[PDB]
Symmetry: D2
Subunit: 268 residues, 4 copies
């Protein structure tokens, strides 16, 4: 049976890329998404096209809140349902890629109590709390699975950020969530090491800029990166993921790989 892989935020951009790659490597993918249901399916189509039954599409709000079912469903629940939506269909889940991520200002000063305490649940859920549970569910299912019938390449990859050291002004929560994630990587790696589950992170610097920001803006940004003076492509990033998941890196765990074109070496 082919290896299965869950990729949160597989709808568009990077997550979309990481999924294909894993698919191309011969992985049945569980394409996760939040708002974009179009792309999440447009993709699954193409994927199943290329190879019959090789891509499903689970949907879930990964923010740290509760959605209506009688009792509301916590974030833990929703998460434990994804990992669960795999063993249910393909009977296995070998690779998890916490990609899903909210990213926007959370200033400390100014120029709405709730906008914040909802962003907190947002930024902190997608980037850190959700990954914790996901990693936990994934780790249990393997634990439960009998020794004799376990996969041989369980790999977990959290998508962090290579610039958190030099915090992006005004993005406090995001930054905390991210560094909270790195800790998750390290901690997960050490503990889950026994079940032979690897946990590593990929720290992109300036990858595919937001489909939103203008051109003059993207220019100003990509021109700050030392290598090539351009942001990375979805590929230059996903390769690091497929590499981390391939056997060519089976002795690697609890580590983060920067893919920033030397961006983190620059100073103001």
């Amino acid at each position: 049976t082919a290896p299965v892989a869950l990729v949160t935020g597989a709808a568009k951009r990077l997550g979309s890329s990481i999924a294909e790659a894993l698919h191309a490597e011969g992985y049945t993918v569980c394409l996760h998404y939040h708002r974009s249901a179009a792309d999440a399916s447009t993709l699954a189509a193409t994927l199943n096209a290329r190879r019959p039954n090789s891509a499903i599409t689970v949907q879930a709000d990964l923010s740290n809140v509760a959605t209506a079912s009688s009792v509301p469903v916590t974030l833990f629940s929703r998460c434990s349902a994804l990992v669960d939506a795999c063993y249910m269909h393909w009977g296995r889940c070998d690779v998890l890629v916490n990609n899903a991520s909210s990213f926007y200002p959370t200033p400390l000063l100014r120029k709405d109590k709730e906008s914040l305490e909802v962003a907190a649940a947002d930024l902190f859920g997608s980037n850190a709390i959700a990954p914790y549970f996901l990693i936990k569910a994934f780790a249990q299912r393997v634990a439960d699975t009998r020794a004799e019938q376990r996969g041989t390449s369980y790999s977990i990859v959290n998508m962090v950020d290579a610039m958190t050291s030099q915090p992006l002004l005004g993005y406090t929560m995001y930054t905390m969530a991210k560094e909270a994630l790195e800790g998750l990587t390290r901690s997960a790696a050490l503990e889950l090491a026994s079940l032979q589950i690897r946990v590593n992170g990929v720290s992109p610097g300036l990858s595919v800029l937001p489909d939103d920001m203008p051109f003059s803006v993207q220019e100003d940004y990509r021109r700050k990166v030392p290598l090539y003076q351009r942001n990375s492509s979805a590929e230059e990033v996903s390769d690091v993921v497929i590499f981390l998941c391939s056997p060519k890196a089976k002795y690697i765990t609890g580590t983060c790989i920067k893919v920033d074109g030397g961006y983190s070496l620059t100073r103001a």
Copy 2:
């Protein structure tokens, strides 16, 4: 109208919080001792302190876990945290130093042997990270909401973190995650509040006053692991770094974490 500096120390009830608060009080600060369940010890401290200097200490109970408390609508962590910064302004009309000391410290295995989780997820992250976030925020605004002329001259925020978070203690994943989120907060906060001359740093203890209940045999096991003096640090040693960062001897220091581990994080397995 000179008036004495105010310091808000969360978890100032006992152990390190108490040491830090007493240390600050001793330097001349008036202190708002926050606590959660140690109502009696916090009162004892305050008592001791107000006997030395009248009206130089007050207490404030408040659960820093990221949940809501009963009041019309229940009260959110955000709100409760604003109440704290406000206590100082309401009582002394100022707040110059904040020390995020309050921290829940317990295991949260990824494997088996529910609700226990969701509470620990709100308790560990709220106390060690989210609460510190709202506090630094509220503390920062008041500074801004204050006239350039009536502004203190030594605003200092100190986040109590962990020096061993790089070598994750087995089983404490959320705590570890939270401590490092707190590190991000330290760096991020420092960068963003520089403009208001509010310094933000962290004190990273290795092994200080060991947990209250852990037995002798278990403790002395931990002491032989510290390269320097083969012991854990006293409270006075940890709190001494805290007074340093709040003194004008450190005014140009911000966004940094000072280790007080005795070399412990240099050791390998």
Copy 3:
């Protein structure tokens, strides 16, 4: 024409594993060595047996000391000469892997001759040599007319994942690796213009010495969080092939650990 890779200390153990791996990817390899002449040749033999003129050898003490000849040859000279050997023979040098490394105690607390020499040896092979080498290497890429340059210049520095937790008694060694780490980031930033990536691979525990009592060996391997065993040479070399592969072309000035989680442990 086929890519060239210069691997210092490629005589045995890991360098031998890295050299052989690059060779497999199609790289033509220059196997430098210091004392291990026998092993280096045996390897060049095997490699040139799988493909004619796919490997050559070069001997050089990378210790920061002056050598024989007329006038003494500085470490710089030997270094630059090492790079020129690749250009003289295959007319191109694309990958440089600083692997050569002296590794032994230099206790702070106790003659002095021993010290002056450990300093030159330990800092020579781990930092000074790598510097000069990178420098000679970059010079060549620069002196090449834009049109003729290679499309994949990659430099990889072999460092250590346990430098943050100093191995008691190896100060000079630890100091040198830290300098090697600095070299990686500094060179990386300064060579980005020339499209020359500079990265590091930091193993934790791999192919233990050789003169390590099986008791002592099994000691260390039960300390490793993943598989409770040290790594293989191949597990460290896969990282090098990856860093030089085009699938890492946007990576530079970074270090990738291959410790199996060993650096995540405390005492």
Copy 4:
């Protein structure tokens, strides 16, 4: 009983001079080392001696990794031992060591020999190799001192650089030497904790800028520092040294304190 001795290298001017003074005013008897500023060394020695008789001396040595003329040429190590010897041979004690002396100039990889070989020795020598030796000489004396005749506060302090994670373009040799000095700090701290010798580093960001640097150059550097938009004074740096040597930091070892004003928190 006696006054603590503090050996400060390159203590003739700037930061060094500020440290020797700060240490002196705390009660320490200081040994002012210099390379070329023999004049400044003297003005300072006179001043420190005027406030207190025989409370400071000067010692000249080239901390660069090159031999000098006396029978045989003197190695860097010899000179380093002579620096510590000087302290014991005058006060019978050496309690504090501040590795402040440091060469700092470009060593560009690309063209634009003997010019490098001398630079390599000077840079690495002063910034890393000498410090290793001075620490060694300093440590052996304590070791060859009976447990009871030992002081109650051995404190070594190395002046490092908070901006090495973001290498100053063109200064590779310098940057490596500092990283080396950083390793020295961690390693020496671990191996000297048994002798109760604390070893820490002070990481300045922008302090007394190198002179002959046009006002406009200095001003455009300061405007980059998040806090106060100015470089620090020498006092703001020495204040951190005096703290590390105080019993207020008696449990602190193997760490580096930044005094950069957040400048290392920024990004390009």
